[PDB]
Amino acid sequence: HLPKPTLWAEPGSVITQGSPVTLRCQGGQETQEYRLYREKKTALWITRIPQELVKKGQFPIPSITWEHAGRYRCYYGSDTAGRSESSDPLELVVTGAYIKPTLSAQPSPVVNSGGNVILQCDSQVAFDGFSLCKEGEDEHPQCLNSQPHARGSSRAIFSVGPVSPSRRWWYRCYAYDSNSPYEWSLPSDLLELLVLGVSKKPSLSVQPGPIVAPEETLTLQCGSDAGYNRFVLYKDGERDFLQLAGAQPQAGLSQANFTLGPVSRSYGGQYRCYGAHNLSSEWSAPSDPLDILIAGQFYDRVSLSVQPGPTVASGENVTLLCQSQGWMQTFLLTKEGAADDPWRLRSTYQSQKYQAEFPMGPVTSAHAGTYRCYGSQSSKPYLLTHPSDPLELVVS
Amino acid sequence: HMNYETINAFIAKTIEELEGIPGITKLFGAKISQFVTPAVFRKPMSLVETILSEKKKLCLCAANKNELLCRGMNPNVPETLPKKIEVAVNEVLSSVNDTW
Ligand SMILES: *[C@@H]1O[C@H](CO)[C@@H](O[C@@H]2O[C@H](CO)[C@@H](O)[C@H](O)[C@H]2NC(C)=O)[C@H](O)[C@H]1NC(C)=O
Ligand SMILES: *[C@@H]1O[C@H](CO)[C@@H](O)[C@H](O)[C@H]1NC(C)=O
Numbered sequence: 001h002l003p004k005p006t007l008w009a010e011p012g013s014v015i016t017q018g019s020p021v022t023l024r025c026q027g028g029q030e031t032q033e034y035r036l037y038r039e040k041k042t043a044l045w046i047t048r049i050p051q052e053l054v055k056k057g058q059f060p061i062p063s064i065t066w067e068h069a070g071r072y073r074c075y076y077g078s079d080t081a082g083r084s085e086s087s088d089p090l091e092l093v094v095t096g097a098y099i100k101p102t103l104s105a106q107p108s109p110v111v112n113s114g115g116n117v118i119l120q121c122d123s124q125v126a127f128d129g130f131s132l133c134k135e136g137e138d139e140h141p142q143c144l145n146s147q148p149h150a151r152g153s154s155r156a157i158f159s160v161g162p163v164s165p166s167r168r169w170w171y172r173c174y175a176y177d178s179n180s181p182y183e184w185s186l187p188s189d190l191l192e193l194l195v196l197g198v199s200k201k202p203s204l205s206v207q208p209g210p211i212v213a214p215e216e217t218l219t220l221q222c223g224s225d226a227g228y229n230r231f232v233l234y235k236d237g238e239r240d241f242l243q244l245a246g247a248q249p250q251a252g253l254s255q256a257n258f259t260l261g262p263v264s265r266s267y268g269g270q271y272r273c274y275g276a277h278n279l280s281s282e283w284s285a286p287s288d289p290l291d292i293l294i295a296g297q298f299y300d301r302v303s304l305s306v307q308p309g310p311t312v313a314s315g316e317n318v319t320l321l322c323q324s325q326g327w328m329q330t331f332l333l334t335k336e337g338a339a340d341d342p343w344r345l346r347s348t349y350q351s352q353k354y355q356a357e358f359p360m361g362p363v364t365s366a367h368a369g370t371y372r373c374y375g376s377q378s379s380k381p382y383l384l385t386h387p388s389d390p391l392e393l394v395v396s
Numbered sequence: 397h398m399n400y401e402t403i404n405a406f407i408a409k410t411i412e413e414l415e416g417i418p419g420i421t422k423l424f425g426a427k428i429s430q431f432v433t434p435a436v437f438r439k440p441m442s443l444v445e446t447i448l449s450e451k452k453k454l455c456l457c458a459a460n461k462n463e464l465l466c467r468g469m470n471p472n473v474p475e476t477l478p479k480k481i482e483v484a485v486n487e488v489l490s491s492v493n494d495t496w
């Protein structure tokens with residue numbers, strides 16, 4: 001009837017190959033009696049441990065290999081007494097055996113507070129075992145695994161539970177063969193989720209503008225009056241979010257920017273920005289989306305004209321006409337230095353070409369500058385033709 | 397000692413141990429049994445080089461290029477397969493050679 005012992009591992013249960021570990025047993029304040037045993041397959045290493053260390057409930061592994069991996073339990077038995085019942089199991093896992101899997105959140109790593117997310121673990125080669133581990137700084141790994149609903153033998157799915165902004169969520173996943181289930185692959189790269197709050201949304205801008213050509217460089221900018229000191233940028237479809245270096249807030253005024261280039265087709269997409277305060281780990285509601293479009297992606301060239309003319313006095317009816325010989329689903333009109341979104345119109349087939357008329361109505365001095373139009377096809381959505389030659393509007 | 401129970405127990409336990417090494421069953425299939433014979437009892441660590449040279453050969457076959465032992469292993473760490481065969485054979489040998 002002796003209190004059962006406790007079995008734990010310094011520094012942890014999930015260790016990389018080669019790294020040290022020490023399995024530790026503790027039962028009451030007494031000693032001089034300890035025993036450790038693997039389940040199913042005896043572990044000989046245990047026999048080779050000094051009797052001075054066993055008495056202290058210490059079973060160290062200088063360099064861990066798959067030969068040490070397995071489930072351990074512990075127990076202590078005196079002379080006159082019989083012995084204590086076996087400790088709760090300790091699953092000693094050895095990582096780095098195989099090529100790392102791929103971890104991703106479906107549909108996005110951006111989760112609303114209280115929401116759930118699917119985390120997908122993917123492997124090149126087939127595996128009948130996958131395990132997902134939660135990581136924390138102050139915390140030790142917390143794994144969970146799946147062989148049932150671990151589909152196609154090359155992918156496993158896990159439904160992360162209620163996400164709270166009460167902690168930083170870090171995840172890695174592992175792949176393994178069930179003929180050695182304590183010998184895991186190399187870990188997948190860390191996955192961090194962005195948990196959301198309802199906090200004032202920031203504003204997302206781009207310099208020089210949203211329509212950008214290949215080999216150019218852009219600067220994505222975030223800002224608030226809400227006094228955020230941290231900013232995050234996230235492009236739809238991406239595995240990860242980008243955490244930009246946040247400035248120090250003035251009159252709540254803060255701005256963070258990211259300068260990327262060369263631009264490629266890959267840059268094209270819908271982007272959102274999020275702010276947070278130094279204390280909070282509950283991000284803001286997203287900025288309105290920003291679509292970055294990639295110029296010069298089609299064989300087709302476009303033309304931009306005006307009806308009346310390039311020079312016209314205030315109040316007159318002015319209409320800009322964008323047109324192409326090749327089929328285009330939509331036409332896009334932009335002005336040099338225009339914080340507003342480009343004007344997108346469905347195409348029309350007139351005079352043996354495809355066009356779109358952008359009516360301005362009566363002219364002001366705001367209604368004057370440098371216009372360029374673009375061709376688009378929905379098949380390639382964040383793509384554009386080269387710009388039309390610039391058209392200059394000069395008002396009297 | 398080299399008698400019927402032990403020769404037989406060595407052969408099955410070795411095959412079982414080899415089929416227990418992750419990757420072997422998928423790559424080697426039913427042919428694995430053919431590598432363990434009373435002859436192997438006489439030279440057991442010979443299994444290490446005979447299975448390795450067959451695996452190397454099997455990994456060239458177009459159909460096996462997405463198999464674990466062929467491209468699933470972490471390249472930047474020394475190959476487990478030779479040690480796993482060496483441990484398997486020695487463990488079986490102990491279990492079998494300790495008749496009493
Ligand atoms: C300037 O004049 C009028 C407004 O006074 C406009 O003309 C109309 O434009 C629409 C465009 O969808 C057409 O469907 C109408 O048929 C036009 N009106 C008439 C009575 O035909 C327009 O804003 C300007 N006109 C042009 C030609 O650009
Ligand atoms: C990017 O932000 C910094 C201040 O954080 C500053 O240089 C400027 O506002 C931005 N850069 C450009 C090129 O506008």
Ligand SMILES: *[C@@H]1O[C@H](CO)[C@@H](O)[C@H](O)[C@H]1NC(C)=O
Binds near residue numbers: 229230278
């Ligand atoms: C958050 O806190 C630090 C102090 O630890 C302070 O210097 C600054 O306001 C913030 N730093 C960062 C990196 O956000």
